[model samples]
Target chain A: MKKLTFEIRSPAHQQNAIHAVQQILPDPTKPIVVTIQERNRSLDQNRKLWACLGDVSRQVEWHGRWLDAESWKCVFTAALKQQDVVPNLAGNGFVVIGQSTSRMRVGEFAELLELIQAFGTERGVKWSDEARLALEWKARW
Target chain B: MKKLTFEIRSPAHQQNAIHAVQQILPDPTKPIVVTIQERNRSLDQNRKLWACLGDVSRQVEWHGRWLDAESWKCVFTAALKQQDVVPNLAGNGFVVIGQSTSRMRVGEFAELLELIQAFGTERGVKWSDEARL
Candidate 1:
């Protein structure tokens, strides 16, 4: 199976996690393909932590400005409405993919999410999880 | 609630086992009260590694050995005669207790049975399992 575990903590939870992914792929321009998974909810079927490509394609209103403050606010608000935190990124919040073999360092995504949140904090944008419901579809074969 | 088990194994296996036991008990000479267990085959019953305290108690014959060699062999030959083995042990073999207790340091007693063999070496002695049946 994939190390496709749901990470409830922040991308910047630790430094070693960032280093692990960097060792896998050093290019700054790309976001490594982490595995696809779907045990996405916490307590409520409504409070999901993950989603598949199909779920994102159907629910995410992808405003090409995926890297902008406005889009970050929208995605975070959606997850907030349903209670989830997207991987923090300065350029783009996150992109959905499926059936990937690549892996992410345990805390890299969590640490990155923290940096993203830091940037948003200055912009007066708080976290939100309204789109958690859209992440309910199964991702594994 | 409590994890417990028994077995009859090779000489090395039994020796290693007793050594592990001495690790916890402060007094080496202290008597550990134990009993004999006999196995019966004609009751339409069959078993491997039984203790006299459990269901095996029905057929047990308690002797001075507490179901050791002589006592366990009687039940082994007469009742469980149908099963095949070396037929008897040369010396009295002992079953262990407290292997599943909270004070234990090695493997669980439930795991001990795995080390024991149904078919022992040609003619070994002191390997007891009659009580375990």
Candidate 2:
């Protein structure tokens, strides 16, 4: 029984990330395709992390694509869903960030960020090329 | 072609509501039943509203039931899900207040607040009962 993580999930993204994604995403249409980059290193060990995606996966359409999380290589893929009235329509990604302990898994965050960045760049969204941490955390408990 | 509302959509409820519910609710051996009072009385004309609920309905489990919105009657419901890791669980009910013209339909927010208060109180949650309206 792992404790609940205080992650704030939202349709919004970080400042630059939001700017990049919206700058390129096409207007609302029926099969709205989205790209995802697989950053999870080992699905076997991250079963819980994958399980956490139940709600998200169910709400959004993956469009019948399979992701190979078995490798260190980042796999790229696209997904489609009807982009109906999402308030502000600020970004085309979902962000979940929060504080955690030292034992917390960083891979999950990294993988999600990779997917967002991939989707952004593939659509000609501009972002800094420099390597920087997309998220920050500090020990509170 | 409608816009998505930012009204909250979460599996967790308010801490107090959870606390009160758990205190009174039976163990997690079966479905935890909850009763909802529907105040939306114009579903017949609000085809768009029903369509809007289509997506929301698919995502949420009204405990495998349909809410009869054709009348000013309360609906019965039962839901079961493992209430595990929830970060800072907030309030139990989701209240949506929107704007619409004569052609458009908008649920009265006051009535919803009244219903939520009534449910919470019936379940041993405290809320004001002053009649100053």
Candidate 3:
């Protein structure tokens, strides 16, 4: 199972890479994920003003046309019903970086990125030339 | 309800007129919700690389595409899955940026920007550009 390696996943050059995995993975399980937001956030505040968004956001969900992990997180938020608001929006592209040690036959992971990419391409996803390192890997015990 | 009278959102512009709401909004409840995550945070102290994403995220579910007030708080979590990650991602064209204020009648909220412009021009559903202001 030790086929693991360090890699980066960005919505940059390898969008095709995201697509390849979706088709390649053999019945992958549903995604089980989490987030890592900030402590000191930045945005303006005025109850009446912000409140307007709450009413509006609740009235109309922020509909996007992507299925990446980020996209799904917004969909299941129960808190949204109560507040009907959100932070800022996502970049045109996203980056999913991390490390996997127990390396198994994991070409599928790379493929998932590709899957997202292809879907994004057809949808005319705009991308920047800046390709930041999105994935970092290290072996674990 | 009319705070700045200008609209500012993400990576910087998309669908807003000039100098309206000169600044973006900031509120925890009207939160640009970001999930604070640490994949195996407790489990992997020595996990080589770490990633941090600022709040403001968008997702899709059975109901449809949406953004969480603090949803990024959960989704921002990192995982022990790979390497080379981008921590902070800015918003772009596709991102929904909502300009809000105290509820007022339709005309009361209207403002002219360009030759032909108005607020709430687009019909959005399932999600919005709300924040924790």
Candidate 4:
């Protein structure tokens, strides 16, 4: 079976989508799956997310180990998602296995920023000017 | 400023949403934050996700530690997101600090399941009938 994707911007587009699906309805044996989701996070949001992670890495120490920005991202993402952090197959260090923030939608990304900021504030980590500005811009809309 | 939420299902509902926003627009100084996103994962997806995790946990061991289903979930989620697993504050176990599968969209959850299936297949995890069926 072929996959069909349609963007429903206006009523006309919606009608066209319906007609397209109708044309493919003849196959009884082929199952169809439909999925709808909002647009992913913006590039600006992506930048801000990294900025926050960078700042956290510079100031925060986990179990006396200073982690890199990417590692901090893994930590924060797990906190936000409430998942576990398990040992790697190598028996040393650790790894997070969960949803990547890159897949977050606009609203979901906002929530992540909020969690990062809260976690940072609690740890006495001063937000960088860049990170703060990015956050301020996000708060506006 | 108070926050307002609306669900727009039809054209009429969309018009009502517009009107609602217009009422709040009078106070431009307060600033408004509008966010749109698809509904979160369904309970069925949540169940399936845990089922896969449980299956992996029962059949798989990491670094000689037999982790529980929850731990397996963390492992797989990190794998799916390509995030790192860091040592815990106590230096005993590992923890994954990233987006939880609970927040995943339908498509994202499906991708995660695919990843888990592939990973399990490679490890020779004989998926239990409960896990596979």
Candidate 5:
């Protein structure tokens, strides 16, 4: 079976969603699952998250390995989720088995930013002016 | 300012939410941020995710290290998100830097399940009956 998604912004959109479902419901015997949820994190939040990661990458080292921004994204995200980081099969690096940050809601993403800032601050990693300003503005809002 | 969250599921809850906001808005000039988002993953989905993890833990061994279910969680999640995994500072193990599964939306979590299933199947990891069913 295939999945269908709809973003209902108005009455017309809701009707269209229902019509789409009806078109596919000819086979009543076929089971289907329906779910409704809030949209994922915003583009602005995504940018801020990456900015924090970039700042941390430039300033922090976990056990002497200087990770790039993307790699640091894994480290801090796992830490923020309090998930365990375990050795890979090769025994050379760690793996984080937890939630994917891409799936974070708007509020959770904010918490992640705060966690990164706190962790970076403790390590003396200087935040970039842009990231600092963005986070500060976020804090006010 | 402290962050306050409310789950508004009914009219009373909605009224209470407004009241809470009113209580906190003693100073109109002091701005506040209000955000509303769907809840996180469900208990059933969580249990199923772990079940898949446990199945993988029993059947698969990555690069000779027999990672526990929790550790395997990191590997697959990184793979699912296509996130990078880098060596740790000590050079002993890898670290997954990406989204936290705890914050996954329901649909995203389902995708993660499908991913784990596909990965395990390719590796010849036999699914347990409980996990399989």
Candidate 6:
């Protein structure tokens, strides 16, 4: 049986995400290899982002930027855009690999897209071109 | 169209959510009314049950307990059980309501099935029967 792991990180926060990756590695029992490079971002840009989200907590920060817990849902929706492997939410910064998704696969995650838009619009968290870039990057990558 | 607002909370941390809500509410142009209710754990319990996690940061907490950012995704995916409204990640403690949901709605959420199994099996967060029932 093929194994799939879905890792995700909110666009708001991901700096500490490397810790999550460390937790998975160093295990001899499971063979491991990565096809795509881990999610990478500009530290300078990341720090600048927190200015808008000052009230946010540090626990959610990733690569110097802060990602809200809510944004994680959007990340997942974005990751499922393709199929072959699970989207590593924590991988790099919103990346997916191989094939197959956690459980939702593409169909359910697709619905989540609409859900995200509706929620985003209602609350004024309107999806932006940048968010789309992050989401789609993982989809095609 | 009636604007149905679905609120949610992540087990991690969040302060901007309230601001998001305020941006849409409190408009004289839009007529609205709210009913007050006592804090009821049972009543609240009556509304929660996504326990692949616990002891989470309330900001990150969804439903009732904290869920991983990745798990948060699954939770939303799971919560969209049967409703037209999608689970707004920032609605009051991660709620999904709607005009309606799809036929696979219940089945999809009910799938202790795979999502839970796959997540848990591969990475170590599994779907529990206790987690289910």
- Per DockQ, the best of the predicted structures is 4
DockQ of 6: 0.02
Candidate 6 lDDT by residue in tens digits, A30-71: 323211112222223323233223222223343344544334
Compose the digit string of candidate 5's lDDT tens values, residues B7-65. Answer: 44554545454454333321222223333333343734664677778889878876666
TM-score of each: 0.16, 0.19, 0.17, 0.35, 0.36, 0.20
lDDT of 6: 0.32
Expressed as tens digits, the lDDT of each residue in B1-133 for candidate 4 is 1223333344454445444433332222222333322223363355456666767878887766777666676666665565535774335556645556655787888888888888888888777543563
Question: TM-score ranking from best to worst?
Answer: 5, 4, 6, 2, 3, 1
Runs in model 6 lying further than 4 Å from the true structure: A1-86, A89-141, B1-49, B53-71, B74-104, B124-132
Of the true interface contacts, the fraction found in model 1 is 0.00
Worst 10 residues of 3 chain B by lDDT: B111-120
Total clashing residue pairs per candidate? 31, 7, 79, 22, 23, 49
lDDT of 2 by residue, A34-139 (tens): 1111221333323433332332333332234322221111121111111111111123322111221112245544555455455444545434322122322223
Q: Compose the digit string of candidate 5's lDDT tens values, residues A1-141.
A: 454544444444455544444343222233233333333554345567777788888777766577766567666665556555555434565554655665555577778788887878888877685767899999999
Model with the higher lDDT, candidate 1 or 6? 6
Q: Write the per-residue lDDT of candidate 4 for residues A1-141, one digit (tens) a residue.
A: 444444444445445444443343322233232333233554345567778788888888887678767667656665556553467534555764555565555577688789888888888987786657799889998
Task: Indicate the worst ten consecutive residues by lDDT in candidate 6 chain A.
Answer: A33-42
Label model 5 with its docking quality class.
incorrect
TM-score of 3: 0.17
Interface RMSD of structure candidate 2 (Å): 24.6
- lDDT by residue (A1-141, candidate 1, tens digit) is 122122222323222322332233222332222211122122122222222222332333333312223223223332322221222112233211111111223243343344444534454442344333244433331
RMSD (CA, angstroms), candidate 3: 24.8
The share of true interface contacts that also appear in candidate 2 amounts to 0.00
